[PDB]
Design a protein around this ligand. Sequence first.
Ligand SMILES: [Zn+2]
Lengths: 92, 157, 188, 93, 87
Amino acid sequence: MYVKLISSDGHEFIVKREHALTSGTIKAMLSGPGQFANEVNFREIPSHVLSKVCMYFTYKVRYTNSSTEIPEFPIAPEIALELLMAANFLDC
Amino acid sequence: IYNLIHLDPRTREGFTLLHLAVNSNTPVDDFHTNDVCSFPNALVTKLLLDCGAEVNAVDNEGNSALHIIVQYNRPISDFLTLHSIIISLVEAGAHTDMTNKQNKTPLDKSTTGVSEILLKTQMKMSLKCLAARAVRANDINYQDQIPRTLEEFVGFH
Amino acid sequence: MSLKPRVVDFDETWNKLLTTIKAVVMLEYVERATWNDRFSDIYALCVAYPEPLGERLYTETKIFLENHVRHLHKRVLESEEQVLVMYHRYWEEYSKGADYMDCLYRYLNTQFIKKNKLTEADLQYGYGGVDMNEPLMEIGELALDMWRKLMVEPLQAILIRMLLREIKNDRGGEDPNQKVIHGVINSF
Amino acid sequence: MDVFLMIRRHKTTIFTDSTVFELKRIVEGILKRPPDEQRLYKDDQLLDDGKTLGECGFTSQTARPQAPATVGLAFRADDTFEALCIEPFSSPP
Amino acid sequence: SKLHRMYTDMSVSADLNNKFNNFIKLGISFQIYVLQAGAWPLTQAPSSTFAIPQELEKSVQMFELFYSQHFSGRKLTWLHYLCTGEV
Ligand SMILES: [Zn+2]
């Protein structure tokens, strides 16, 4: 029910798996012999951007076709390019 | 119909089959304007999409077959047709937010009230698009830093 | 950042990739950390700083699959009258291998193949095609289409003849293994 | 209850969405460690077990979907959990 | 013409009821109608705002919860004086 994400920095983030399955790439990575039983490690992603990605997961989870205005997702200026890069490899 | 959409039928200003089909069909006359060939009809566009016309066909003003729909003047007239055509257009992966020249989000160019809301019922939030808008908000170098494919993607935003 | 376009050896990367690929297709256990590490080499190849290299990788994977299917065809056609029980083994292996392989090439499928893929619409009503080329297809599509092209066509008459013969044996009352025959028929 | 909360141990982060003892039981179930051994230090201040959400003094304005409330947890160190900090994440260059 | 739109109402009402279960996938037995206000001769707007019982409010909140998604731009009208239930 809970899945572990390990960044290249070394920090480990535990997340509800129903949240994590939003991104197709993670779903495909779990599929296959690596059934892991879970924990997942990325050799190149730094911790902070992956934390922002996790916050994106939970923020999308909170509001789905929800009524009224949806609060915008704050973006830091420098990390914008890194987020654009990291969008592909997770395909969220 | 398929052999015709395969060659580019593009007119002088840049319109294609879809763009003519969706907007107001001005040259209807001599009993074509009567009892037949109602402009902004749905079945013709459905057939055209089924035959395999390009959905997000670029326009010289970048109306992109979506900014045309919102500028429909009276929405109550043939309202169900507008709902069906929006459902069909969001089908087959038409990017919702597409800006050419000055930033023309279809939400902004839309000025018909409830129709706007209909588009809001169909948008899907993606981290890629949102981040692309955020980086577009600033002025950041994106030449040779990112992979080739996303240059055209960041460029779209 | 290690997600920036860069220059790496195609040959050296393929050497390391093939070792994992061969173990995967044979349903043999592979280390999960190795699987996760290999999953990034695909992106590293698909975005190379000088020029993209997906085209060569496509044909390389194709030729590897063809070599393996040729070996399997040799082994199967070597045995005579034991094909019934042999068919199920390597069909079971190859199907799971193809599914996992299709899972593993997800980025290549999503960002490369679909752009040059033939739209299903023109394959149906449009027609419009007569070139002497094989258009780019899905990895699983390659696997299955190739498997039909290179193995079942040469070795179909004797298989169907023995299946029909076994049907008479069942009509006699005796019941052979229903699972094997059912899987063979379902393979079609 | 509908509170965006985070737990930060050294090389460990927990995301979760009405008393402190309930959260201690939840994290016990997550990590299989006794709840009394663990403890919470909000702004380097121990939180008594059973402290309900209302008296925590932080509501939706603090617990945000994009900016969840961050909470430091002193995991048990020998007898009790004190002086435990998470290593800060790498900052962009 | 007015008679023609009478018959379509039931088919519309059934479709509006058949398309009411998707996104949910109460403690009471709930069977209700969704009418086309533009067709039925029920133009008597309720002059009194009847406070819905709290037991039925959960279904009412459930009712307006899903009507937005697959019926976009459509506004609901509650005719409580016509709705009935078993106690
Ligand atoms: Zn976008």
